[PDB]
Each structure stands twice: as C-alpha cells, then as structure tokens.
Design brief:
This is part of a larger assembly, with six copies of chain A. The first copy, chain A, is mainly α and 157 residues long. Helix content of chain A is 78%, strand content 0%. Chain A has a single domain, classed as Ferritin (Up-down Bundle), CATH 1.20.1260.10. Chains in contact: A-B, A-C, B-C, B-D, B-E, C-E, C-F, D-E, E-F. The PDB classes it as oxidoreductase.
Chain lengths: 157, 157, 157, 158, 157, 158
C-alpha cells in the first residue's frame, strides 16, 4: 500500500523541512542576520502548517497516519555564510517538490482523484517557493561579492 | 556545561510534547472525537511556541542550541479510549514540569539569575496545565461510566 | 550592609551608563552619524529611567540612598570610528550585567526576596540589551569593510 | 440589649456563611467541579456583602458591633459527593433564615421600626435563597442517579 | 511538611488581616472618620482577594487547604485615636510581610520554584503596602499635633 | 573663543549638577514622606537634564566641542532636616543657575556671538520664572510651617 506510505512520509518530509528552516533561523540569529532569521522562522511555521494539512486530509480520507521521528537537521554543521544556508534551503525545497510529484504519480496510478486534487495547490506553492528561494540566493550571491554589502540587505529588506 | 545541555534538552522536550499532542489529536480525530482533537491540536501549537521561546532566549543569551531529532510519539499505538489518551497527556505534562524544575535547579546552582527569571512564567504555566489536564481527566473518567455520555462532553468544544 | 552598598553602587552605575551613552551620542553627532547619535541619546534616557527605578524602590524599602558623583565619561577621548564607540557600549553593558548579577547574589544570600523579585525584569532587560548591542556591533564591523557603506546603515535608520 | 446581641450574632452568622461557602468552593475545586465551585465562590462574596451591610447599618444606628471569631468550617472533613455539599449549604441557608427571624422578632418586640424596615429585603432574599438551593439540590440528587451525568451538567451549566 | 503548613497559615493571615481592616473601618466610622473608614474597608476587601488568590493557587497546585478560624480582632478595644489605629495597621502589614518571607524561605529550601514565582508579586506589593502605611502614619502623627487639623486629611483624601 | 567654549561646557555641567541636586531633594522628601514635594523635585530634575541636553545639542551644531565633566555628589542633603531647608537650597541652586547663564551671556556679548545670545534668551526668561516660583513656594512653606502639621496637609492636597 505504497500510496498510504508515501502520504505518511510526506507528513514527515513537511515536518523535516520545518526543522531545517528552524535550523536556518537559529544559524542566522546566532550570526546576527535577524532579517534572514525572521524569514526562516516564518517559513518553518508555514512548513508545519502544510504538514498539519496533510494530516487533516488523511484523517478525513481514513489514511492511517503514524508520526515518525523528525530527523536532526545537519546542514547547520557546515554552514559558514548566508550563501551556504540559502543553498541548503534551495535543495530542501527541490526535494520537497520531488516528494510531492512522487506522491502525485502514485495517486495517478491508483486513480485516486481526490488525492490528486488535494495535491494541486501544493504543486503550485512549490513552483512559487523554488522561484522565491532561487531569487533570494541569486541576490545573496551577487551582494556577497562586496564586503559588508549583504549585511545592508538583511537590515533594509 | 550541564546548563547548556539542559537548555538544549528543554527545547527538545517542548517539540517532543508538541508531537505527542499531535498524535493525541490524530487518535481523537480518527475515532470521531473532534472536540478533543481540536483541543490537542491547539496544545500542539502551543508547545511548539514554548520551544520557540526557549530557542529565542538561548540565542539572545549565547546558549548555543543544536536541534536534536524529535522522537516519534510512542503511546498512540496503545490508546483504546479517551481516558487512555488524557492519561498519557497528564504524564507528559508531569514530565514537562519535572524537566523545567531540573533546568531551574541547575540555573540556581550556577547563580544564573537571568535563566531563573526567564523560567518563572513557565513554572506558573505548568501548574495551570497540570491542573487543567487533571481536571479534564477526572471528568472523562466519571462520564465514561455511562455508555455514550462522554460523547456529550465532546460537543462542548 | 553590603546589600545597601551594592544597591547604592547600582544607582551610580546606571547614571554612569546614562552619561557614557550621552558621550557616545555626542561623538556620533560631532562626526555626522545622526542615526547612531539619536539611538545613543534614547539609550541615555532609558539608563537614567533605570536609575530612577532603583531609587524609587530603595526609598520604598528603606534602603538609604546617598547619590555619588557621576564620573566623567573617558572613552570618548580614544574613539576614532563608530566601531570603537559600539565596542565601548558593549563593554558598558557587560559591566551593567555583572553589577546586577552581583547585586542579585548579595540579595540571595540575605534571603531578600523582594530585592530579587525587583531585579528580575532588569536581568532579562540586560540579556536583550547585550544581544542587541552585540548584533549592531557585528553589522557595523561587517559594513565598515567597505568605504562609505556604514554611512548607509546610519541614514537608513 | 438582646437586640444589640442578636445584631452582632447576625454579623457573625453572615461571615460564617461566607466561610462555609468558600470551603464548599474549595471542595468542589479540589474535586474538579469547577462550575459548582464558581457558584459557591460567588455566594461567599455575597454573604460577606450582607455582613458588611449589617455592619454599616449598625454603625449608622449606633448599635456597637464587636467583630467575633469566625469559626473554621468543619463539614468539608466529611463531604464526599456534591450531594453532601449542597445539603450542608441548604442547612446553612435555613440557619441564616432562622437568625434573621430571631432578629426580626426581637426588633418587633422592641417596636424598632427602623430595624424591621432594614430587614425586609433580607427576609425576601432568604426566601429566594432557600428556594434556589433546594431546587439545585433536587437536581443534583436526581442526576447523581446515573454515573457521570452530574459531571456533565457541572460543565454545560453553572 | 513545613511548606503546606506555611501555605495554609498564609491564607489564614490574609483573612485575619481582612478582619483587622474591617475592625478599623468600624472604629473610624463609629468615630466619624468616614474617609479613613472607607480606606480600611477597601483594604479589607483587598486582603480578602489576596487570600482567595492563595487558595486558588493551592487548589491548582494540590496544596490541600483547610480554612482555619478567623480570630476575633482585639486591637479595637484599645484604640483611642486615629494614630493608634494606623499603628496597629502598620504592625499588621509588617507581620503580613514576615510570613510571606517565611513562606518564601521554606519554598526556596524545598526548591519549589513554582511557589517562589507565585510569591514574587506579593513580595513587591508588601513593599508598597508598608511604604504607604508608614507614610500615612507619618502624616497623621504630624497633623494630629494641631487640634482639629487631622479632620482635614479625612474630608479631603 | 576659549572662555566662551569653557563657559558653555561649564553650563552643561551646571544643568546636570542641578538635575542631581533636584533628585537629591526628591529623595529626601520621599524618605520623609513628603510625596507631593518629592514628585515636584523629580519633575524638576528631568527638566534640568533636558536643559542640559538642549545645550549639548546647540554646542554640537555650532561645533563647540563638549567634553562631559564629572557630575558632583549632591552634599546639601546632609544638612536638610525640614522642608524649609530643602527649598532654600533649591532657591540658591536656581540663583546660581541664573548667575551662570548671565556669565555665559556676558562672554558671548563680548565676543559679539549673536547666535549664542539668541539661543540663551528663552533660558534667561525661564530663569526669571523659576526663581519667582521657588521663591513663592519657599514663602508658602515658611508661613505654613509655623503651625504644626499644617505644612503636611498641603503637600497632601496641593
Ligand atoms: Fe511562503
Ligand atoms: Fe512544504
Ligand atoms: Fe514558502
Ligand atoms: Fe516563502
Ligand atoms: Fe511546554
Ligand atoms: Fe507543557
Ligand atoms: Fe497547555
Ligand atoms: Fe495553555
Ligand atoms: Fe532599550
Ligand atoms: Fe536599546
Ligand atoms: Fe541599565
Ligand atoms: Fe538598552
Ligand atoms: Fe445567595
Ligand atoms: Fe444570590
Ligand atoms: Fe445564589
Ligand atoms: Fe446571608
Ligand atoms: Fe445565606
Ligand atoms: Fe493594601
Ligand atoms: Fe492596596
Ligand atoms: Fe491601599
Ligand atoms: Fe495581604
Ligand atoms: Fe497586607
Ligand atoms: Fe524648573
Ligand atoms: Fe536649568
Ligand atoms: Fe533651572
Ligand atoms: Fe518648576
Ligand atoms: Fe518648569
């Protein structure tokens, strides 16, 4: 019952992303990027709400949910500049997107029209999230070419 | 530094309790106790906010946080009735209280007045939380003596 | 009483900090850093308000206060750029913190519960104050790596 | 004066009632009947207000008031269900009614028209108070026949 | 244990003070000091509210409370002037302060952080209460040096 | 101008000195339970500090280098034992704030420093107001304090 397992794992993936955003928030705060830290913190809350959405839909559709361990974030070990963090967040969102497309591909195989309809807005959110992060990362990578300049973006924007 | 250690453990414990309250709402939902499930769901969010509060203080005080795995909730698999769930949630809160007091003990021994001040409203919150859950459990245990009657409590949320 | 002595020293320490913030405001103003000047000026009034809070408590609790001289700020003479100012201010705040922690320890030993309670919000204020000065100093030190760029933090504030 | 004496005893009886209501609040609360607890709590403040009213009238009328001890409520030692509590509260109000009629009898005897006029709203309050408490007791006694049912109306109601 | 006892005594002391304040309102009213009487009456209600706050906390923390007798006030038999009343009220509050501090000592000894946190605002209120009473008494004692002058305090504040 | 810069610096010192003397006075009044008088001195302390900040602000704009001096420990408190003594000391403080403004203005006139003279003018008028008001309070205090308790009644009302 691959579909029920993938749905279950999607919840884990959402909560996993929430923790990694939190991890990014903490690294930014510890290094005095309060603007970038606030953005990561909001995204952490948003990834948790996506998870809660999946759980609620599962409850309604009698998809048994069993909550799994939420793994320790580990990219924070290696981050040493804002660019490192944003790049890890971009990889996280790309993985998020692949996991949703797998889910929707299993639903399609099983003719599970309800699940596919449920997933639609999420596919469009991922498009927007990858673009947004991609854009932030491009800015960060450009600005960090001059010492101190990126520190101006955080504060202003 | 056992203080740093206990502070990290507290963050973990708050997120752990968040997940346990989510598993409770899941079980309540799946068994058609929507009122009780709404309540657990809001407590889940609240525990997460307590975790965030600790993280924020730790950042400001240069207590380095490293996010740990959030363990899977274990007790659901054994719950059979609402009484079982409210009992596990009472134990959870009793544990929550214990670890706040341990943390506070270690702060005291260190003369860390800032940490003690920070924890005061959580100590008072814990008193309230254990009271409220104790009270709910007593009602549940009294009302469940008549078949069907507890379902009536549940349509009071 | 050493408690009495320390309580009186704390008043002087708050007024001393007010003067030193004022000295910084002056140095910033004379050097055309109006945004940083305004910020230091507001911190000078706040420090004076803390002094006054201690004085008022002392009157109420029969701690005799005798006001001491407020020494001339000395660090201005050596400041050459905004980094030097902000680093002196961070030191000032670290010393404000230590003096409050010593007062609290003296209060603890005498079982002076009222003094300990009165001090709690100042312990938490200090945590915030050090985090905030720490974070400005980090930005200032990063942005001053490019000529003129820090002058852009000041105006955009 | 028997009147001065009864007037002072009236004050004591009110403050005693206030304490007994408070002990009922505490038993309810400790036993997780928060609605019944809130009711008793509000009744304790009301009884205190009746005592203060008597005190104020006494001062105006030059009846010297000497505040007496308010004894420890002791029935809580033996309460074990809400029914026991409300039974004790009914007895309490029947006693409040009796000390009021004693005071009024003595006032009538002495032709103290002012005192009797002062007492009239209290005589009507007691009527209402005894009626309300008796009705709550009848409800509690009927509901407690089915396990759990009483609890379900502490919550919904009070 | 010492904590449950002291906690019960504290409720007793608050209700006793409530009666003592009532007793003073009585004495003032009987002697045509309506202003001072109204003030004592408000204080009587306020002490009663403190007692109820302790009771509520004890309920929540499972500190069994059993209400003790409220003794007959007895200072009233000896009061001859406003000054004697206000002197008894000062001693009353100094005794209120004493017992709070003992309760706090005992809580500290047991590491009862919740009780200590609950007590902190009462410690600060006692400081204010003793100040205010000390100050009223100074005024009464000064003003009563000229016949009839104290009747002025009363009809104004 | 050298004596003009020095006097302008001393003027800053004088305002903050006065601010601390007024605070000393608030503390003495509070400790002796004159709350009304205490609140008035505290308000004055803040206002004196504001005047100082106004001088600092003008100095900065005019490029008069300000170096902040020690603010001395107030010492009149040691001597005060009634409200009269506190108010007299405050009158003499405002009389010295006045002399010191007039000195400054004298140096500026000499130097033809028109902007400084313009800047001082409202402070000259304020000092008139301040010496008049302290004078009036001190006369009231000294009159009232001839009857025991009387002064106390008017801290409390006014
Ligand atoms: Fe978003
Ligand atoms: Fe997501
Ligand atoms: Fe997003
Ligand atoms: Fe986003
Ligand atoms: Fe928690
Ligand atoms: Fe909790
Ligand atoms: Fe909760
Ligand atoms: Fe809550
Ligand atoms: Fe601030
Ligand atoms: Fe600040
Ligand atoms: Fe400070
Ligand atoms: Fe600050
Ligand atoms: Fe009633
Ligand atoms: Fe009623
Ligand atoms: Fe009623
Ligand atoms: Fe009554
Ligand atoms: Fe009654
Ligand atoms: Fe009070
Ligand atoms: Fe009060
Ligand atoms: Fe008061
Ligand atoms: Fe009290
Ligand atoms: Fe009191
Ligand atoms: Fe003035
Ligand atoms: Fe001035
Ligand atoms: Fe002046
Ligand atoms: Fe003035
Ligand atoms: Fe003025």
């Amino acid at each position: 019952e691959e579909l029920l397992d993938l749905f279950n794992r999607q919840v884990t993936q959402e909560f996993t992303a929430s923790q990694v955003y939190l991890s990014a928030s903490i690294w930014f705060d510890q290094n005095d990027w309060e603007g970038m830290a606030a953005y990561m913190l909001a995204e952490s809350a948003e990834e948790r709400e996506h998870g809660l959405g999946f759980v609620d839909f599962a409850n309604k559709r009698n998809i048994p949910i069993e909550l799994q361990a939420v793994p320790a974030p580990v990219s924070c070990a290696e981050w040493s500049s804002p660019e490192d963090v944003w790049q890890s967040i971009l990889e996280l969102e790309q993985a998020n997107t692949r996991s949703l497309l797998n889910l929707a591909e299993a639903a399609s195989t099983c003719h599970d029209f309800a699940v596919m309809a449920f997933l639609n807005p999420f596919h469009l959110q991922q498009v927007n999230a990858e673009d947004k992060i991609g854009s932030i990362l491009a800015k960060v990578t450009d600005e960090n070419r001059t010492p101190g300049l990126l520190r101006s973006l955080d504060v202003v924007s």
